[PDB]
Amino acid sequence: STGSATTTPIDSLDDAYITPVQIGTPAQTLNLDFDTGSSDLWVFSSETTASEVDGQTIYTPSKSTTAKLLSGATWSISYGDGSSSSGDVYTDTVSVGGLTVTGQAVESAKKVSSSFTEDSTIDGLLGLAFSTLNTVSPTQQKTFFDNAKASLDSPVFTADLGYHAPGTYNFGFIDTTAYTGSITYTAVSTKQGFWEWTSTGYAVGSGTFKSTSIDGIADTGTTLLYLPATVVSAYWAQVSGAKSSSSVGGYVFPCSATLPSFTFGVGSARIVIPGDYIDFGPISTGSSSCFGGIQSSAGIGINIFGDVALKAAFVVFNGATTPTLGFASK
Template sequence: MVGSASTIAIAAAVAGLATATPVRTKVGTFSVPQVKNPGFKPHGPAQLAKAYLKYGVKLPEGLAKTVSDLKILRRDSGSAKTTPEENDIQYLTPVSIGTPAQTLNLDFDSGSSDLWVFSTELPAGSVNGQTQYDASKSSTAKKLSGASWDISYGDGSSSSGDVYTDTVTVGGVTFKSQAVEAAKQVSDQFQTDSNNDGLLGLAFSSINTVTPTAQKTFFDNIASSLDTAAWTADLKYHEAGTYDFGVIDSSKYTGDITYTDVDSSQGFWSFTATSASVGSGRNNTVLKASGFSGIADTGTTLALFPDSVVTAYYKQVTGAKLDNTQGGYVFPCTTTPPDFTFGVEDATITIPGKYINYAPVDESGSSCFGGIQTDEGIGFSIFGDVALKAAFVVFDNSKGTPRLGWAAKSS
């Protein structure tokens, strides 16, 4: 979520997948660019809170108070407060829904499996500038009788609604009977991000939350029509990147792609990293020589790693300290953190230190929040955007069993 605050919890319905109308023509490949969220103002504690809530972890007392005091998780008189710490995501992707097309900017989230949107079925007080899907204005919308969705959040709030099938187009590729989950109720955390109109999940369909029958993701619905049943993330540092479907664009990476097996049993793109170290090349110091499991999650901004790894890393960062009020490690903004390197099979991926200097936590701009924080309480590590931006990443389901590919970026 990106990202997006307090998103989908990991518990979900795993009933048989719904049968959808097949794509009748081979579409081959397509690419979709991200667009910059004009309201984005990075705030590390808010992004950490978002990640914890997404995976059902109770916020530490200091972090909970910080986000509450900043009014990131509140509304005032029916409208979201605009603060320098607005809790939203940096990049969104345009998606067309319905006939005629209604364009909504969605967060592509490999950590969830629902395509849900703000809709005209929401109370007026729950909408804060978001574009709303109006099923009544789409000639191709069909209500899925008896279907509903109800997503629970780690802070006890939830979002829910009913379900339609409708024409959905991403990057020029259309699926005519995609499940579109229309929100009738959304939590305050989503209301505060006026530019984000919903999520498009890219995890595995087994954790889609529609009941009584789970629905397929957009990718699973179109996979058989692609040249290759794979999609790639080429996320960028401080600029919009691209998602490609059906093609592995050789111009976007250098050297070889290193593939590693994915455990999809929990519905996520889960894999085992082989090591972690601080620095790169001959100047690196091993932080963890054995493997640790994690998921590749485009919907989470920060990278969350084992507590022992994070503690050892920040011992190498000048002026770093654990700030319980902010909920994580901070350091002077003038500090350039060392690189962080993790292993994938026999390859290494290096997160540049500048990525780890995420954003100031105070108005003076003197103290900055680390882009790497602890995964304590989650049960696995989260390779969010801070990590994914360091590589060209392939989400591949073309070989019968899923796998993740990692390669050095071409630029």
């Protein structure tokens, strides 16, 4: 089997991407944030505290003939941005882009944090990291990918995120029309439950390439590119008037600037992030200070290749017995 679904930016900045997902019988379609940095499929639901729902579409298990309470199971998750959610669990039929899993754990939110409530465009998350990170207790649950894997034509999914445009998540096949050149594969460590890999270095604009190992994760659920402070300082030093602002929470730059590109290494291959991808616009409405898309990881504990980086590539998440990542230009 295969599946193919279009993923659409939630706003003009590509802050996140939503993908429609069919849950239950008859289908209830929710728009979920596919997150390669977490392992829970959770949804706004009929159980979510009413004051914490503001415009999201909800899953109502009582209207699904295939929903079953997963008795005793609870979940609770905290993300890198300080957001959180928790609740109980149903199993139900879940389909993405024509690919169906029966008996998928659908984590029904009873509580969500303010950032989820305030984002009416995101109806929940679909985690695509390794199932070792799933938070369901007392019986950990599998991701949609892990449940689909054995049925797929190839044990892979691909992320093809757009810049200010829709893109695609494919399951079970590699669309050889969707990228240019060849795909460079690189090793993955699953020790932390992430798609963790080591970049071979970076360049700023037309500058020379610096060969240096940068361990980080491929995380579709993170907007920006978070790298070591040395690398980030080297990038923003090439933008007149750029500075790190403790008041704003990162590097800002004059909105009048033209940003340089940023290149990262994948083995001997190179992925170029155009300068425009690194512009996240005014820090507040009407400001002439703009927020940068490359930020320091120093306060995180891991480097994150988020959407800024991933949307410059066609990315293969190879879930074979030995997982690997692949990157191609596009």
